[PDB]
Each structure stands twice: as C-alpha cells, then as structure tokens.
C-alpha cells in the first residue's frame, strides 16, 4: 500500500511558485494538552517540517503554540483569535500532519464522487483562497491535493478541478451544498471539519447551509470527526453552535475576544416613510469614487421601487430580490463586486449566502423587527483596517426595537440621538417622590 508519510519528489518550479512571496492567552477545558514553544516540541512528520522551513516559519505564533498540540491530540477546539494571528496554519499544520501519518483510511484505498478527508468552511471567496494557498504550501511533496470552491464563479471549472482529486476541500457553504446536490462531493469520510471566521459566516446568513452540511448529510458525528471553530467574536449564536458541533473541547482565547459590531460607525436618523427616498439621495451624494454601498429594504416590491427611483435619478445601481431570475441576480452581484454598479439594493433574505465583500457603507433603508438581524446586516461592513459605516432609517414602525438598538449603540460606544434615548425612557425606574 501507499506511504503517505514519506515525501514525494520535489519540483523547484513549483517551489518558486509556492514559497517566493511575502498578548494574553486563555485556555480552558478538560485535560488540555500543554502548549508548545517550538514546532519540534511535537512530532508533525517529515513532510510538514520540510514545508515549514520552505515557508520560513521559525517559531509558532501564540495561537499556534496552543492550538497545534490541541488538534494533534485529537481534541475539539473553539478558538477566539483575530486575523494575522496565524490561525490558518494553526489548523492546517496538525490536520495535514495526521493525514500523512494515518493515511487515507481503508475506505479510500478500497475505492482508489469525491470524498474529502478534511473540510474547511469559509464565509468569502477571498478567505477561501487564502486558506487554499496556505494548504498548497503544506501539502507540497505530499499526496494530499487541496481544492477550493466558492460562489460567484464558474461551477464547471470548479467541478473539473474537484475531479482531479481533493483530500482537503476549502469551501463557502453555498457552493459546497451545490456540489453535494450535484453528486460531486460525499462527506462519508470527512474526519476534519474546520469553521474559519464562523461569526461572519452567520452574519452572512450561512447557518442553515452549515447545519445542513454538518448535521443533515453523511458527515461523521462529533466524537468521530474532529471539529475546530475559529471566530474573532463570541456571540450567543456562536456559543450555541460550539455546543452543538463540538465534543469535549478546549476553549482558546488569544487576546481579548472581539466585541459585537466592532470597527463600525453606526448612525441612526429619524425618517418618515415618505422621505426615505430623498434622504437616501443625500447619503449617496457623500459617497466616494467607488466605495460599495449596500442598501437593505424589507420587501421585494420595495427593492424594485427603490432601484427604479435610483435609476431615474441617474445613479449606477442594481438590485437583488426573490422576484428576479437567477441569471439576473448573479450578474447583479457581479456588477456590484466589480464596481460597475456600486449601489446594491437588496432584501435581507435575498442577501443570504451571497459573497458581498464587506462594503464601505451599509444603509438600513428599512430597519428589521429584530436586533439580531440588525447585527447581522451591519456586519456586512467593517473589517480591521477599514472602519465601516452603517446608517439606519428609523420611524414609528421601528418603535419595538427602540431599547435594543439604544443598548447596542451604547455598548458599541456610538453616538446616540437624543430623541432615541428619550423615546426609550421608562418612568418606573425614577422612584417615589
């Protein structure tokens, strides 16, 4: 049989291809394996150590010091770390290491529809490619062929890439489901599940697809598969997702766990329904050359009406809602992402699963009845380096979220309209006399 631990012949055109480019730590859980200080503190194999040297990694990052020995000891992981912490290599290195050591497993040898040994789920195309490229570096001179798929691109070329073999699959949840329904991917032998930037995936409304992939198909249950979740923040829906997806897991926090709606400037203004169009025009006239603007409306009839208004007023824009054919919605998303139509009108429901690459300005033309939905919507702007802007139109129709919105603005240390805190005021708490 095949030896998956002993490296394949090199290829320096491929080497130049791959490798010629540019404080507190909390760990809680039961029987947590001790952290490492060097990559050699645990045995990650011949192939991994060789590829580590090609990538010129000299010392493990904080998150790698703790996560790598955890994953290698086959323990589930909930990790709160931010971008630039080296979390990609933190799960790729021990996973690939174990695959080299263990091999494909008797199933894939008795067969040799693609069956990934490892699956990494990402919110966006950009992050998906980042993970994919790192995987190529560490799968070099091995028999693990990494593949990446994502929406907004030709599925035909992605299917072709898949059929050349994939043992590690990086995917956005929507395109993976599409591959599964088309019968191109099976999860029967997926032993390594990774959710990278899980919080943003839920922001973009990927949770149903994720739970369909993990819980409703053929993927091994927890305790059999090894599952790792990485998230910058730790809101309640992530905690619930962690409890459901993880078994006997270690909680790792590198730095302070990020706040909800961080890196976002939020403005709330009072606008009557009749004035929302004109008010929007003033907001659009304070827009840069092409900074992408995402406008949320409640209904599809409202979306069409708004776009019709914007078109007549001379604005380059497009729309995405349910009453559109799929050919129109895919082209609309293409024209938004390319800046040809820098203004996207969309209902929240239609925006779900779409790779809208965090715009510079989110405008809540209509506010939701739900503050958790508000958090998901404004999450469509703001990163780490780029401060995002979220402007919301508020009137009597939104009175039910007055207090939650106020509380959120205060927690995020944002500006509060004096009329908003006035409307939220409760005389019960003043006291007698």
Q: Which stretch binds ligand AMP (CB under 6 A): 60-68, 234-242, 255-263, 299-307?
A: 60-68
Min dist. Cβ of residue 331 to ligand AMP (A): 31
Structure tokens given for 117: 């040994």
57 lines the binding site for ligand AMP (CB under 6 A): yes
Min dist. Cβ of residue 208 to ligand AMP (A): 26
Q: Which stretch binds ligand AMP (CB under 6 A): 87-95, 210-218, 239-247, 262-270?
A: 87-95
87 lines the binding site for ligand AMP (CB under 6 A): yes
Min dist. Cβ of residue 135 to ligand AMP (A): 12
Q: With respect to ligand AMP, which residue has the nearer C-beta, 36 or 401?
A: 36
Q: Is 81 annotated as a binding residue?
A: yes
89 lines the binding site for ligand AMP (CB under 6 A): yes
Min dist. Cβ of residue 372 to ligand AMP (A): 27
Q: Is 42 annotated as a binding residue?
A: no
Min dist. Cβ of residue 168 to ligand AMP (A): 16
Q: With respect to ligand AMP, which residue has the nearer C-beta, 170 or 283?
A: 170
Of residues 7, 35, 61, 151, which one binds ligand AMP by CB under 6 A? 61
Q: Is 425 annotated as a binding residue?
A: no
Q: Three-state secondary structure along the chain?
A: CCCCCCCCCCCHHHHHHHHCCCCCEEEECCCCCCCCCCHHHCCCCHHHHHHHHHCCCCCCCHHHHHHHHHHHCCCCEEEECCCCCCHHHHHHHHHHHHHHHHCCCHHHHCCCCECCCEEEECCCHHHHHHHHHHHHHHCCCCCCCEEEECCCCCHHHHHHHHHCCCCEEEECHHHHHHHHHCCCECCCCCCEEEEECHHHHHHCCCHHHHHHHHHCCCCCCECCEEEEEECCECCHHHHHHHHHHCCCCEEEEECCCECCCCCEEEEEEECCHHHHHHHHHHHHCCCCCCCCEEEEECCHHHHHHHHHHHHHCCCCEEEECCCCCHHHHHHHHHHHHCCCCCEEEEEHHHHCCCCCCCECEEEECCCCCCHHHHHHHHCCECCCCCCEEEEEEECHHHHHHHHHHHHHHHHCCCCCCHHHHHHHCCHHHCCCC
Q: Is 83 annotated as a binding residue?
A: yes
Site pattern 133..172 for ligand AMP (x: CB under 6 A): ----------------------------------------
Of residues 24, 84, 385, 431, which one binds ligand AMP by CB under 6 A? 84
88 lines the binding site for ligand AMP (CB under 6 A): yes
Q: Which stretch binds ligand AMP (CB under 6 A): 58-66, 210-218, 305-313, 392-400?
A: 58-66
Q: Is 156 annotated as a binding residue?
A: no
Rounded-to-integer distance, Cα 374 and Cα 260, Å: 11
Min dist. Cβ of residue 60 to ligand AMP (A): 5
Q: Which stretch binds ligand AMP (CB under 6 A): 72-80, 86-94, 140-148, 303-311?
A: 86-94
Q: Is 339 annotated as a binding residue?
A: no
Q: Is 293 annotated as a binding residue?
A: no
Asked if 186 and 113 count as a contact pair (C-beta separation under 8 A), the reply is yes
Q: Is 85 annotated as a binding residue?
A: yes
Q: Which stretch binds ligand AMP (CB under 6 A): 82-90, 203-211, 220-228, 266-274?
A: 82-90
Of residues 27, 48, 51, 85, which one binds ligand AMP by CB under 6 A? 85
Min dist. Cβ of residue 153 to ligand AMP (A): 22
Q: With respect to ligand AMP, which residue has the nearer C-beta, 94 or 342?
A: 94
**Range 417-422 contact pairs with CB under 8 angstroms and sequence separation of 24 or more:** 417/268, 417/269, 417/270, 419/270, 420/268, 420/394
Q: How large is the angle between the packed helices 125-138 and 46-54, nearest 10 degrees?
A: 120
Give the residue ranges of the annotated binding site for ATP.
57-64, 81-88
**Contacts to ligand AMP by CB under 6 A:** 57, 60-61, 64, 83-89
């Amino acid at each position: 049989e095949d030896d998956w631990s002993k490296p394949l012949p090199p290829s320096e055109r491929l080497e130049q291809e791959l490798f010629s480019g540019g404080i507190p730590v909390e760990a809680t859980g039961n029987n947590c394996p001790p952290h490492i200080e060097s990559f050699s503190d645990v045995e990650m194999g011949e192939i991994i150590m060789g590829n580590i040297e090609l990538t010129r990694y000299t010392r493990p990052t904080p998150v790698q010091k703790h996560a790598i020995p955890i994953i290698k000891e086959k323990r589930d992981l909930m990790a709160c770390a931010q971008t630039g912490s080296g979390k990609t290599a933190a799960f790729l290195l021990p996973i690939l290491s174990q695959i080299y050591s263990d091999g494909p497993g008797e199933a894939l040898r008795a067969m040799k529809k693609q069956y990934p040994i490892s699956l990494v789920l990402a919110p966006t195309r950009e992050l998906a490619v980042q993970i994919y490229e790192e995987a190529r570096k560490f799968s070099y001179r091995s028999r693990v062929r990494p593949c990446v798929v994502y929406g907004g691109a030709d599925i035909g070329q992605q299917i072709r890439d898949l059929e050349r073999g994939c043992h590690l699959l990086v995917a956005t949840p929507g395109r993976l489901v599409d591959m599964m329904e088309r019968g191109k991917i099976g999860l029967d032998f997926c032993k390594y599940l990774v959710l990278d930037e899980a919080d943003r995936m839920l922001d973009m409304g990927f949770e149903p697809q994720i739970r369909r992939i993990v819980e409703q198909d053929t993927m091994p249950p927890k305790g059999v598969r090894h599952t790792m979740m990485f998230s910058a923040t730790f809101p309640k829906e992530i905690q619930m997702l962690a409890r459901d997806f993880l078994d006997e897991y270690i909680f790792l926090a590198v730095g302070r766990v990020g706040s909800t709606s961080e890196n976002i400037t939020q403005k709330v203004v009072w606008v009557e329904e009749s004035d929302k169009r004109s008010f929007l025009l003033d907001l659009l006239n304070a827009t840069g050359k092409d900074s992408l603007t995402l406008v949320f409306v409640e209904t599809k009839k409202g979306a069409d009406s708004l776009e019709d208004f914007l078109y007549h007023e001379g604005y380059a824009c497009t729309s995405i809602h349910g009453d559109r054919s799929q050919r129109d919605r895919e082209e609309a998303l293409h024209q938004f992402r390319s800046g040809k139509s820098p203004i996207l009108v969309a209902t929240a429901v239609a925006a779900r699963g779409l790779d809208i690459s965090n715009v510079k300005h989110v405008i809540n033309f209509d506010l939701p009845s739900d503050i958790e939905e508000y958090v998901h919507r404004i999450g469509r702007t703001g990163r780490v380096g780029n401060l995002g802007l979220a402007t919301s139109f508020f009137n009597e129709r939104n009175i039910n979220i007055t207090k939650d919105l106020l509380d959120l603005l205060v927690e995020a240390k944002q500006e509060v309209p004096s009329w908003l805190e006035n409307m939220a005021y409760e005389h019960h708490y003043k006291g007698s006399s």
